[PDB]
Design a protein around this ligand. Structure first.
Ligand SMILES: CCn1cc(-c2cccc(C(F)(F)F)c2)c2sc(/C(N)=N/C3CCS(=O)(=O)CC3)cc2c1=O
Ligand SMILES: [Cl-]
Length: 119
C-alpha cells in the first residue's frame, strides 16, 4: 500500500519526532496555547500535519518534507522569545533534524529508492 517514498518519509518522520521529547510539535499550535498565533504566523506547520500529508500522498519529494520541517522549527524560533522553553526546544529539534535530513542522506535515500526501483 505504501510507496517506497512514503515509507522513507514515515521513517524520517519517526526519527524527527524522537528529537521532540516534549511533544511541543505534535499538533497544530492553537490560539489558546499561543495567544495571537493565528494572527502572526503565516504558514503554520506541525508533525501531525506532516504525517497527514505523507499518508495523503501529498509529498512529492524528501526535500518538500525537509522544507516543511524547517518551516515548523523557524515559526517556533520567531514567535517565541529566545529565553523560552519553546524556542530552546525548536533550536534543538532543528539542529538534530538537519542531521537526519542532511543533504547527504536525503539524496542517498532517494537513489537507494531509485536503485531498488530499477532492480
Ligand atoms: C513549538 C510549537 N509550539 C508549541 C506550543 C505548545 C504545544 C502544546 C503544549 C504546550 C505547553 F503548554 F505544554 F507548553 C505548548 C507553544 S506554546 C507557546 C506560547 N504560549 N508562547 C508564548 C511564550 C512567551 S513569548 O515568547 O513572549 C510569546 C509567545 C508557543 C508554542 C509553540 O510555538
Ligand atoms: Cl543530535
Amino acid at each position: 500500500e505504501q510507496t517506497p517514498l512514503q515509507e522513507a518519509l514515515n521513517q524520517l518522520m519517526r526519527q524527527l519526532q524522537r528529537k521532540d521529547p516534549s511533544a511541543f510539535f505534535s499538533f497544530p499550535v492553537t490560539d489558546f496555547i499561543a495567544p495571537g498565533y493565528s494572527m502572526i504566523i503565516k504558514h503554520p506547520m506541525d508533525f501531525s500535519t506532516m504525517k497527514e500529508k505523507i499518508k495523503n500522498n501529498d509529498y512529492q519529494s524528501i526535500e518538500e518534507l525537509k522544507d516543511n520541517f524547517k518551516l515548523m522549527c523557524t515559526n517556533a524560533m520567531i514567535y517565541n522569545k529566545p529565553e523560552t522553553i519553546y524556542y530552546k526546544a525548536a533550536k534543538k529539534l532543528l539542529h538534530s533534524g538537519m542531521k537526519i535530513l542532511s543533504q547527504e542522506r536525503i539524496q542517498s535515500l532517494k537513489q537507494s529508492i531509485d536503485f531498488m526501483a530499477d532492480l
